[PDB]
Design a protein around this ligand. Structure first.
Ligand SMILES: *[C@@H]1O[C@H](CO)[C@@H](O)[C@H](O)[C@H]1NC(C)=O
Ligand SMILES: *[C@@H]1O[C@H](CO)[C@@H](O)[C@H](O)[C@H]1NC(C)=O
Ligand SMILES: *[C@@H]1O[C@H](CO)[C@@H](O)[C@H](O)[C@H]1NC(C)=O
Ligand SMILES: *[C@@H]1O[C@H](CO)[C@@H](O)[C@H](O)[C@H]1NC(C)=O
Ligand SMILES: *[C@@H]1O[C@H](CO)[C@@H](O)[C@H](O)[C@H]1NC(C)=O
Ligand SMILES: *[C@@H]1O[C@H](CO)[C@@H](O)[C@H](O)[C@H]1NC(C)=O
Ligand SMILES: *[C@@H]1O[C@H](CO)[C@@H](O)[C@H](O)[C@H]1NC(C)=O
Ligand SMILES: *[C@@H]1O[C@H](CO)[C@@H](O)[C@H](O)[C@H]1NC(C)=O
Ligand SMILES: *[C@@H]1O[C@H](CO)[C@@H](O)[C@H](O)[C@H]1NC(C)=O
Ligand SMILES: *[C@@H]1O[C@H](CO)[C@@H](O)[C@H](O)[C@H]1NC(C)=O
Ligand SMILES: *[C@@H]1O[C@H](CO)[C@@H](O)[C@H](O)[C@H]1NC(C)=O
Ligand SMILES: *[C@@H]1O[C@H](CO)[C@@H](O)[C@H](O)[C@H]1NC(C)=O
Lengths: 369, 414, 204, 99, 49
């Protein structure tokens, strides 16, 4: 706000207009990034008083209206673990209380209606039957859920409990979000500290230059400060344009994980966490999103003898969906991702030619029901 | 808005157009309060003064001068100042100041001027050709004159060369005027270099005695122990002002504060060197200096092709400091606050949006995220679609920029 | 003889309040863990600037002389405490080469379980003095724990200095070096810890 | 005087090429996505939710546009839901049947 | 390694240090890229003889 300097800054023309226009491009993009991640539902779905979900306990990830704003228990942990010279910071368009209504809506749709709320109107389905479809989506037969439902619910409830213990005891997972806060703070600190630099001028303060000197010498001394301070903004705006492209690549990724992991069951290996993907739940965090990816990880292997096909009445039989195995004395067909042995039959198998062609075929009775 | 966008027609949106800034209401100038004034007045009231052939350099140091109390005053039988306007003397600084001082006859006071000729100037006390300083003189015929003549006051008149600027020579030794060696005694060819005034009360006003101070100055490599006088002003709180404390200038809002300053601490800084508190040197309270409020003025507009109605957002400014309506984005003016939420037409911030609607006016509202829906969920209920709709959905993706090439030499040098 | 200075001898480099913050600054400071000279008077060089400390309450350490000549060929800085007040003068003194107790002039100024500590430097025509007083529990050798030294005076003496001497259980002498320090300020506006950036790789 | 103009005109031109490189990286990210939608939506049928428009994807048709591409994503959207009582299994001769 | 030049370069303030910090960001990111591509396997699996 020195008028002597402002008359010199007019001689540089359009540079200040394009610096403001570049930062306005950054600023609108942050709202559009936030819109593309969270605002994927046309309707704010919500969850009934009958919390009856087959033994699964979502109370750590759903809202509780007793809290400060409509955040879940885990969203409150995530909101704890992340923490004036013509510079201004603007508010986001959606407040954290609005992001928490979108993550609640996405989660209430996911629990009550599966993937159906992503394809059309939400269709209700019982939660144990939604998990039966999600088990069937990873090639495990749906009876393997229903015959183990209490075990599967207790493993899930235990695993959500470990997420609270993790987020209560270590910050290190949120290093991604804290680094994004720290970089913007460090860039603003550096931009402000550069007001104190001389750039070869007699002094860093405009009134000091103006007080000491002949107007024509003072003009030449101020044009150094204008050159240095303008190069200081052009350095900062270039860093922010690159940093916004880095964040936008992560917003496009988060918008894709919302669509594919939450609104569906994407089969893309190690996209929605390690193991076979069952479902995931979004939770808000300061400047980001957190996905709790729920996955089926196989355990307790047994070694078996195996064969590509088996002979019968000279006919060669191949397994219709499973794989052939033997315990050493008897031959069975099992599904592939979980040991469940069945007797080999004329309707567990299909025939193609005879025993001559297949390498490593074996001999056993196929039962004909 | 039209000037910011360089266009006569403006489409719907929110546009930043200029910055608002609270103006300084007054100037505050807190030097240390006016103390240790230089003792010029004590010299002006001295009981006696030096004989001019033997004039005295009375030292002044470690004090603030004021020449304005002098140049405004008729209190002297003669007053003069040189080299600068009298108004400029109160801006000067020096390592030492002096009352270069003596008794002379009234007719000779006018000899004391920059580089000028005269018996006092050329043989007793010489000013340089561009001297900056003042001459102060007053009649002393009531004390320095005596019956039969007071001979104790004398000036030099005869010398082998005239004085250089500030040159000094107290010698009473015989002036040899010819071939005769004088042997330390007066005689033919062997005269006194001084003339006594012989002051008497019966003499006319120009041959009466006058007591004189020449205010006379010295700046060396050593610090300026003397300067012209500090200003002072009153002080006021919770208003934007231009300010100085000692030499700490700024524009800001002065406020009462709890910062635990140690006795020597003059001011306080934030993490980014931002000075944000001060000790007032005229009353030892601690003032927090808050910035004067400023922010981007954004203009919120429908398409000008539909109406000239507009609203204004003052980003981060409280409406107390600028229909009128406070928001967490800042003060909003010219828009109706409506309690029914709608989809966001024009964005503002922190859940607020605005639109032009029904008779029509700009309205502002908390935006609506979507229709609420209680899904009919229970442990044994399922919904199945009995029909379908095929849907065709457009999606548009950019793939290429306009291919550009620039001759940098023709652009730069034409 | 010599002794380790530990964290001693850090002073407020500017007359500024700072709260719950770390500030990095370059000036003349006493280096951490430096070998300060130990004494039970000699004439000593001034170098860039001086740190002085003593175990005292008897005023047998009456003060100091500073100058170039230390004698009446030119102006000399004399500091004396008379046990009622401190008096300071710059005149061409010709006082003793080794004074002890009875038990032109251009400027003038007027102001064991106890450890008393002081710092002196001259810049461009001003003389700077800083000081602190504290209890200590140890017999001899300086306390390892931190405390800061506070500015007294900014005397417009004009003269330069190249040497100094003490005026008659221990006293300690250190020399400042141009150093970068990180200074830790508490919530109440005071320095309470520091890092000498050139001390070691962890400090850097 | 000319060295002042060369300094300004060169800084003006460096600022333009810097922002065209960043804008070109933004358009490359969009051209990689468009090439991926061509490969996965047009040449195939994607099971990736929302990737080829809303609803379950059937097919899409590319249409050109100046400096871009337009995909007409044809999707099946389920409609007119009835709601029914359901069970995970059905019990026959003391044995559980699953669909 | 000129002292007379280096004392002038300090008057430009953070323009030197933030470029060393930017190229350090480039350099560490190359190891992050190489980790994310190859370190997807939790054990060094080996083929039988
Ligand atoms: C399977 O058989 C091999 C035979 O060498 C043995 O090393 C291995 O421990 C067995 N179990 C599993 C789970 O691989
Ligand atoms: C293999 O399975 C059959 C049926 O479970 C059983 O009778 C037989 O004893 C098993 N053989 C071994 C070696 O466990
Ligand atoms: C299985 O592998 C062994 C060598 O590891 C080999 O001797 C045997 O012939 C193989 N089986 C068949 C069906 O060839
Ligand atoms: C399977 O049975 C045929 C005769 O039906 C015999 O030739 C063949 O060797 C048998 N193969 C094995 C692996 O026992
Ligand atoms: C001058 O300033 C001091 C220190 O702020 C204050 O104590 C004193 O009352 C002031 N005196 C007058 C006459 O204003
Ligand atoms: C302005 O409004 C008129 C209403 O008829 C419409 O035809 C026109 O497309 C609008 N836009 C411009 C740029 O005139
Ligand atoms: C605005 O100023 C008034 C002044 O009384 C104050 O009460 C209020 O808290 C300030 N902030 C807002 C958001 O109104
Ligand atoms: C709008 O709601 C506020 C409380 O949120 C209330 O004070 C105000 O009177 C309401 N205005 C109208 C027109 O209903
Ligand atoms: C179907 O859903 C509606 C809406 O919730 C409910 O009123 C009705 O009782 C349900 N009927 C059956 C058979 O589930
Ligand atoms: C299915 O919807 C179409 C319109 O989309 C309608 O013409 C048709 O009659 C409907 N069929 C049934 C069985 O409801
Ligand atoms: C210098 O310092 C070290 C560590 O304080 C000490 O061991 C050594 O005796 C000292 N040497 C001298 C010459 O003072
Ligand atoms: C800071 O100052 C307050 C003044 O009331 C004092 O009570 C407090 O103990 C001080 N803090 C420390 C850490 O000494």
């Amino acid at each position: 706000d020195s008028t002597e300097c402002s008359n010199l800054l007019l001689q540089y023309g359009s540079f200040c207009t394009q610096l403001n226009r570049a930062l306005t491009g950054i600023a609108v993009e942050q709202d559009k990034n936030t819109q593309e991640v969270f605002a994927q539902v046309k309707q704010i779905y919500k969850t009934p008083p009958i919390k009856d979900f087959g033994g699964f306990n979502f109370s750590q990830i759903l809202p509780d209206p007793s809290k400060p704003s409509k955040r879940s228990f885990i969203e409150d942990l995530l909101f704890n673990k992340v923490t004036f010279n013509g510079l201004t910071v603007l508010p986001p368009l959606l407040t954290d209380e609005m992001i928490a209504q979108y993550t609640s809506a996405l989660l209430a749709g996911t629990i009550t209606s599966g993937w159906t709320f992503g394809a059309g109107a939400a269709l209700q389905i019982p939660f144990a039957m939604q998990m039966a479809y999600r088990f069937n989506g990873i090639g495990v037969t749906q009876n393997v859920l229903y015959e183990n439902q209490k075990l599967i619910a207790n493993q899930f409830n235990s695993a959500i409990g470990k997420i609270q213990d993790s987020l209560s005891s270590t910050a290190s997972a949120l290093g991604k979000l804290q680094d994004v806060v720290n970089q913007n703070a460090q860039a603003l600190n550096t931009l402000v500290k550069q007001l104190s630099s001389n750039f070869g001028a007699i002094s860093s303060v405009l009134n000091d230059i103006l007080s000491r000197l002949d107007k024509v010498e003072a003009e030449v001394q101020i044009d150094r400060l204008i050159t240095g301070r303008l190069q200081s903004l052009q350095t900062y705006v270039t860093q922010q344009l690159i940093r916004a492209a880095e964040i936008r690549a992560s917003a496009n990724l988060a918008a894709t994980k919302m669509s594919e992991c939450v609104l569906g069951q994407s089969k893309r290996v190690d996209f929605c966490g390690k193991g076979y993907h069952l479902m995931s739940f979004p939770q808000s965090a300061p400047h980001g999103v957190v996905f709790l990816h729920v996955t089926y990880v196989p355990a307790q292997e047994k070694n078996f003898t195996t064969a590509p096909a088996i002979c019968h009445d000279g006919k060669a039989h191949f397994p219709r969906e499973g794989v052939f195995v033997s315990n050493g004395t008897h031959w069975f067909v099992t599904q592939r991702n979980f040991y469940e042995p069945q007797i080999i039959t004329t309707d567990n198998t299909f025939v193609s030619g005879n025993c001559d062609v297949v390498i490593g075929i074996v001999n056993n009775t196929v039962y004909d029901p | 808005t039209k000037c910011t966008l360089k266009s006569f027609t403006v489409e719907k949106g929110i546009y930043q157009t200029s910055n608002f800034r609270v103006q300084p209401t007054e100037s505050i100038v807190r030097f240390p309060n006016i103390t240790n004034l230089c003792p010029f007045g004590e010299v002006f009231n001295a009981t006696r003064f030096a004989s001019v052939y033997a004039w005295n350099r009375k030292r002044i140091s470690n004090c603030v001068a004021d020449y304005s109390v002098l140049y405004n005053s008729a209190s002297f039988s003669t007053f003069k100042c040189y080299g600068v306007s009298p108004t400029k003397l109160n801006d000067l600084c020096f390592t030492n100041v002096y009352a270069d001082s003596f008794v002379i006859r009234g007719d000779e006071v006018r000899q004391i001027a920059p580089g000028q000729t005269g018996n006092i100037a050329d043989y007793n006390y010489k000013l340089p050709d561009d001297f900056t300083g003042c001459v102060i003189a007053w009649n002393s015929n009531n004390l320095d004159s005596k019956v039969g003549g007071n001979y104790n006051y004398l000036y030099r008149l005869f010398r082998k060369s005239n004085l250089k600027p500030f040159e000094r020579d107290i010698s009473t030794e015989i002036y040899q005027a010819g071939s005769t060696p004088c042997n330390g005694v007066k005689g033919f060819n062997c005269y006194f270099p001084l003339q006594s005034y012989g002051f008497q009360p019966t003499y006319g006003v120009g041959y009466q005695p006058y007591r004189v101070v020449v205010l006379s100055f010295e700046l060396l490599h050593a610090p300026a122990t003397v300067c012209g006088p500090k200003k002072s002003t009153n002080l006021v709180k919770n208003k934007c002002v231009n300010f100085n404390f000692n030499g700490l200038t700024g524009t800001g809002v002065l406020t009462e504060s709890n910062k635990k300053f140690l006795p020597f601490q003059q001011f306080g800084r934030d993490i980014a060197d931002t000075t944000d508190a001060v000790r007032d040197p005229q009353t030892l309270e601690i003032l927090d200096i808050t910035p004067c409020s400023f922010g981007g003025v954004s203009v919120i507009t429908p398409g000008t092709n539909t109406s000239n109605q507009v609203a204004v957002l003052y980003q981060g400014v409280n409406c107390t400091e600028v229909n009128v309506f406070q928001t967490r984005a800042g003060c909003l003016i010219g828009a109706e606050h409506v309690n029914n939420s709608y989809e966001c037409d024009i964005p503002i911030g922190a859940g607020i949006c605005a639109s032009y609607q029904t008779s029509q006016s700009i309205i502002a509202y908390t935006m609506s995220l979507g229709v609420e829906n209680s899904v009919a969920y229970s442990n044994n209920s399922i919904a199945i679609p009995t029909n379908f709709t095929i849907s065709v959905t457009t999606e548009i993706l950019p793939v290429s920029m306009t291919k550009t090439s620039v001759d940098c030499t023709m652009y730069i040098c034409g | 003889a010599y002794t380790n200075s530990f964290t001693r001898g850090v002073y407020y480099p500017d007359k500024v309040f700072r709260s719950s913050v770390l500030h990095s600054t370059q000036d003349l400071f006493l280096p951490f863990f430096s070998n300060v000279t130990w004494f039970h008077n000699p004439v000593l060089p001034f170098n860039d600037g001086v740190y002085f400390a003593s175990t005292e309450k008897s005023n047998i350490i009456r003060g100091w002389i500073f100058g170039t000549t230390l004698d009446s060929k030119t102006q000399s800085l004399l500091i004396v405490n008379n046990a009622t007040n401190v008096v300071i003068k710059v005149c061409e003194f010709q006082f003793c080469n080794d004074p002890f107790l009875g038990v032109n002039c251009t400027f003038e100024y007027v102001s064991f379980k106890n450890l008393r500590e002081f710092v002196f430097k001259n810049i461009d025509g001003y003389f700077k003095i800083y000081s602190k007083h504290t209890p200590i529990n140890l017999v001899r050798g300086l306390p390892q724990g931190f405390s800061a030294l506070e500015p007294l005076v900014d005397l417009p003496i004009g003269i330069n200095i190249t040497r100094f001497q003490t005026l008659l259980a221990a006293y300690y002498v250190g020399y400042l070096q141009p150093r970068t320090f990180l200074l830790k300020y508490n919530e109440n506006g005071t320095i309470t810890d520091a890092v000498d950036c050139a001390l070691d790789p962890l400090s850097e």
